[PDB]
Structures are given as C-alpha cells and as structure tokens.
Design a binder for this molecule. Structure first.
Ligand SMILES: O=c1[nH]c(S)nc2[nH]cnc12
Length: 266
DNA sequence: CTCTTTTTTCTCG
DNA sequence: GCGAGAAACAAAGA
C-alpha cells in the first residue's frame, strides 16, 4: 500500500472502530510487534480507540489518551473487520477483539509492523525517520523541495522513494508522477531546472490527492478505482498515447520502473 | 529443477 | 558518508 491506500484504510477504520473498547489482543505472529507483544497486550487491553491518524504510509491508532499504535502495512498488509466467530486464515497474524467484532491483520510476506509508542513520542518517532512533509499545498513547501534537490546527486526516483523529500510515494505513484512531470527516473536531482521542479511538486500533490479521492489502487481498502487511471505503472509494452510510443520497463536501484522514454529524457 | 517478480532497513565496499 | 540492491518473507511465474 502507498499513501492513498493507507489513507483509504484509515478512513474506513475511523468510521467503524473508533469508540470501541479493546476486549483482547491475540497473535499467531508476535514477532511483527516490534516493541514487544506482551507489553502491547498488557497496555492496550481495556482501552478505547479514540482515533486513527496517518503519517506518510504509517497508520497511527490513538488508543487511550497516552498510547499510539503505529502500524505499517509494508508490501502486502491488509486489515479486515470480521465477526467474532470468523475462522483464522493462513496469513492472519494479529487480531484485536472488540465486543461485537474483531480487527484482523494479515500479511502474506510478514513484513508489516506494529509499534506501541507514547503519545508524546510520536513526533520524535517520525523525526528519527526523517519523514518529509505530507503531499499537500499547505505542508509540502516547494522552496525546501527545490533546495534539497539541488544539493543532491541522487537519482530522482529513488530519492522520492526515501520518504524524506515528501511522504507517501511508493513504486506505483512515483512512476505516475515522473510521467506526469515528464522527468526521467534516473535524472540526477541537481540537474533539474526550476520549472521541472515546480511541475514535479504540483504533480506529486495532484496525483496523490486524486488517488485518495478514487479510493486508491486495487478486506478494507480493496474497493479503490485509481488503478483505472494509471498511465504507466505495470503497462509495459502499451501505448503512451504519444504517436506510437510504448511504455518501457527498466530497473532503477532494484525497483521495477515504468516510463515513456520519448517523454522522459534527461 | 532455477531464477525473477512484487516497503523499509541494513550491509557492502 | 555514498548508492545500489538484497533481505525480512511468500507466492507466483518464467
Ligand atoms: O496523439 C498524440 N501524439 C503525439 S506525438 N503527441 C500527443 N500529445 C497528445 N496527444 C498526442
């Protein structure tokens, strides 16, 4: 999941589980609770979910006044709301049981994580990760963006994927953003001119906000419609609608990369 | 059979 | 520090 999918999930969870008391917490895979499963179980049980927030691709459960549960879904994490008599499925790892249902976390690849953090430790937590600003006109300052790009010789695609320039892009939407802004994914950032940087900046906010509005690209968060709007990602060999040009796939710093070479030259 | 594909952290050199 | 890319892991596919 990338930011739009994670934001979709956050909204669905906000509608359903906020206000509910955690009756118990059970795990078949406690290793994904990085801060310690017994501790999390002991602290959160009996507490009421007060809210759900998000920061980049991180979910933040506000549980009680003093605790935050930071969940990351990584590559394949999925939440679903189920009745209490629901059977366990093969890649279900964690369950948060309420009086009238349960929240189950599943993850085929077991990459996803849970971290129990104090409320006053949430900002330090994200500072330590050097998470960049949220992809909004209010938070995503073009000038800071411009300066970070000029001071770096990194390739633009892997630099955007680092979460430090701006939070929330993953492989899908970075490919889409660079196509939209007509920038080659291997372009060194200190080579970008001001006008490209401006378009890139606006593109990042436009693509992500549109994907959020369409419910993301597609068990919560599975009814998204952004996958019909994708111009390049996963469309290797198809047309760019540029006079017969086709989408190429390459590897960039180990990641599959879809782009239109005709439109995205260095 | 083998190897490659599909977020963040970590290791290498 | 760098930057690339394998590994945490599973499953599918070539
Ligand atoms: O069909 C098109 N062909 C080309 S070469 N460029 C375009 N820009 C928008 N549509 C087109």
């Amino acid at each position: 999941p990338e930011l739009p999918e994670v934001e979709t999930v956050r909204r669905e969870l906000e509608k359903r589980i906020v206000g509910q008391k955690i009756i118990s917490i059970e795990a078949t895979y406690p290793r994904m609770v990085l801060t310690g499963f017994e501790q999390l179980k002991k602290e959160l049980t009996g507490k009421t979910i007060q809210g759900i927030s998000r920061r980049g691709k991180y979910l933040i459960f506000e549980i009680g006044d003093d605790f935050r549960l930071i969940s990351h879904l990584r590559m394949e994490g999925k939440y679903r709301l189920a009745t209490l008599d629901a059977p366990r499925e093969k890649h279900d790892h964690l369950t948060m049981k309420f009086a009238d249902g349960q929240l189950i976390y599943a993850d085929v690849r077991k990459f996803g994580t849970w971290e129990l953090i104090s409320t006053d430790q949430v900002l330090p937590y994200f500072l330590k990760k050097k998470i960049g600003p949220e992809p909004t006109y209010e938070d995503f300052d073009e000038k800071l963006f411009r300066e970070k790009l000029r001071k770096s010789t990194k390739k633009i695609k892997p630099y955007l994927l680092e979460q430090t320039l701006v939070a929330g892009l993953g492989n899908i939407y970075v490919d889409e953003v660079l196509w939209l802004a007509k920038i080659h994914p291997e372009k060194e950032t200190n080579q970008l001119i001001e006008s490209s940087i401006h378009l890139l900046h606006d593109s990042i906010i436009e693509i992500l906000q549109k994907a959020i509005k369409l419910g993301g690209s597609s068990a919560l968060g599975s009814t998204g419609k952004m996958q019909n709007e994708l111009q390049v990602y996963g469309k290797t060999g198809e047309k760019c609608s540029r006079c017969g040009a086709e989408i190429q796939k390459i590897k960039v710093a180990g990641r599959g990369t879809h782009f239109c070479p005709v439109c995205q030259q260095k």
